[PDB]
């Protein structure tokens, strides 16, 4: 459904993965930052488009960007 992309400016603060309401983001090993960790979006099929993740990023400009797109039952948050 929606598209979430992570950029090299990430600092591995883990704040984004701790804010997702649907477990779409994970922290994976990396060497480009001091923390030695980067964020990934393995399960974008469950993204609802809340953008809470973006609100949590501390980088000058979001290192995590959510681009809204095709809509499915899951993305539209339909319990019915």
Partner 1 sequence: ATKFPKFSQALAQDPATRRIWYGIATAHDLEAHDGMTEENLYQKIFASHFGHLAIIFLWTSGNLFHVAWQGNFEKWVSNPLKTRPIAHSIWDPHFGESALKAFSKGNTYPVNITFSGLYQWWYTIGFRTNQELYKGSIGLLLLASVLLIAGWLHLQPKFRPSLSWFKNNESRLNHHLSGLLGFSSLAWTGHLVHVAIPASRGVHVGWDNFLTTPPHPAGLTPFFTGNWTVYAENPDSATHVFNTSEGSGTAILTFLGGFHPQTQSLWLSDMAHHHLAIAVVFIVAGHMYRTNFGIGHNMKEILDAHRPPGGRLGAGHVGLFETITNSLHMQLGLALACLGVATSLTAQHMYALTPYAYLSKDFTTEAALYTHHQYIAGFLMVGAFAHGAIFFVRDYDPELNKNNVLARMLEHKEAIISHLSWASLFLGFHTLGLYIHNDTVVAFGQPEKQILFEPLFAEYIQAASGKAVYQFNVLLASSTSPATAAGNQVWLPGWLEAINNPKTDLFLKIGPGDFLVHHAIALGLHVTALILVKGALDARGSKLMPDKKDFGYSFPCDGPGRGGTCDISAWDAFYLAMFWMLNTIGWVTFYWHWKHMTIWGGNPGQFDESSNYIMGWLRDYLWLNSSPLINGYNPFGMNNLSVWSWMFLFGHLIWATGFMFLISWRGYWQELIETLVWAHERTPLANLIRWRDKPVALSIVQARLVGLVHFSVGYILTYAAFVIASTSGKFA
Partner 2 sequence: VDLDYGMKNSYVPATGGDGGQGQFGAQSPNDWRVAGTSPVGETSYAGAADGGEEPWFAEAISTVSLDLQKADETLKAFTKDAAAFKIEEFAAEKPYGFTSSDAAMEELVGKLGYSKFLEMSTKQLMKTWGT
Write down the least CB distance from residue 29 to partner 1, Å: 28
Among 8, 29, 34, 67, binds partner 1 (CB under 8 A): 67
On whether the CB atoms of residues 3 and 66 are closer than 8 A, the answer is yes
Nearest in space to 1 (alpha carbons), one of 50, 77, 72: 72
Residue 28 as a binder of partner 1 (CB under 8 A): the answer is no
From the list ligand SF4, partner 2, partner 1, none, pick the one residue 45 interacts with, judged by a Cβ distance below 5 to 8 Å according to partner type. partner 2
State the Cα–Cα distance between residues 61 and 77, nearest whole angstrom: 28
Pick out the residues of the known binding site.
10, 13, 16, 20, 47, 50, 53, 57
């Amino acid at each position: 459904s929606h598209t979430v992309k992570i950029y090299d400016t990430c600092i591995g603060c883990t704040q984004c993965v701790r804010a997702c309401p649907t477990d779409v983001l994970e922290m994976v090993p990396w060497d480009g930052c001091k923390s030695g960790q980067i964020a990934s979006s393995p399960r974008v099929e469950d993204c609802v488009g809340c953008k809470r993740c973006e609100t949590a990023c501390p980088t000058d400009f979001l290192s995590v960007r959510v681009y809204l797109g095709a809509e499915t039952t899951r993305s539209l948050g339909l319990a019915y």
